Design a binder for this molecule. Sequence first.
Ligand SMILES: O=c1ccn([C@@H]2O[C@H](COP(=O)(O)OP(=O)(O)OP(=O)(O)O)[C@@H](O)[C@H]2OP(=O)(O)O)c(=O)[nH]1
Ligand SMILES: [Mg+2]
Length: 306
Amino acid sequence: SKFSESTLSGWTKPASVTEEDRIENTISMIKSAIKNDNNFDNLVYEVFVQGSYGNNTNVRTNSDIDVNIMLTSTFYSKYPEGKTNSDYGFTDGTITYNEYKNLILTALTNKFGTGNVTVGNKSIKITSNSYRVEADCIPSLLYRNYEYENSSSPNNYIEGIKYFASDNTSVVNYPKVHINNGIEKNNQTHKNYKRLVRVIKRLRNKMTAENHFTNENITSFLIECLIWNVPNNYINDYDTWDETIKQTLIFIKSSINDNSYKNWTEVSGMFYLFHNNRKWTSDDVSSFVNSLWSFMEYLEHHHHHH
Ligand SMILES: O=c1ccn([C@@H]2O[C@H](COP(=O)(O)OP(=O)(O)OP(=O)(O)O)[C@@H](O)[C@H]2OP(=O)(O)O)c(=O)[nH]1
Ligand SMILES: [Mg+2]
């Protein structure tokens, strides 16, 4: 490639933490807001980090921490066909998503100030210089998936989250299963899976910056999911990032061309990576991989002359 091993390895590094206790303080300050609110006294909820910070795949210190405030005492369920709430002894629920979301807004407002709380389409942005909190908060209800493994045991389900965007479209995600699956792949690749995720994101950013390639449908989440689908041998068998990235591009290109990409899941295993309601298509990923191949000059320029 046009880049040195030293340069590529630098682009695999985790994002610097400018505060040693940023995640710690962020969780603390949000948990403080809820626990001091008497309207959450009878509710069971969890505050946890998801997205790039949760997966240690963020490449920019300046980026937003994704914090899920997950209600668990009320939840949504997916049942095997023909089953209903009453088959598990469950009610329709004591509190609605909208009621929960308004309680969360009151708590965060009292803690942070009406000026420092903005409701976005898929998150509540906290800009609190006072508490040093810069966070996107996702109020969600726990999603019990009983259908995936065919459980009739109320205690046996796949745990996801469900919330409604501002437009009231339904979102179901499996952030905890995502995180667990990525740690597992990182353990099987001597921590090179996440290093590879980070260098591909940085190269996407560089390609855009230097006007080589722009496609808004190539998201950070998509890149993490794509590299998660690269077989461990492509990460384990090579002694350079130069070669690891070369074989990664060849495999992804090969996998779109031979239609095996259609069986690829997101990191959670709970949805297909490519489907008609994703922002991206296989054509977007083909273009991305082709632009990266060209940008990295894996086909060396004639006479090494650009
Ligand atoms: O399970 C998921 C998780 C995410 N998404 C899509 O990716 C977008 C960004 O979500 P994040 O949790 O913030 O991902 P992250 O790794 O932090 O990337 P970054 O913040 O660095 O971009 C989601 O909004 C969603 O895409 P849209 O559906 O909103 O277009 C999943 O789809 N499922
Ligand atoms: Mg994010």
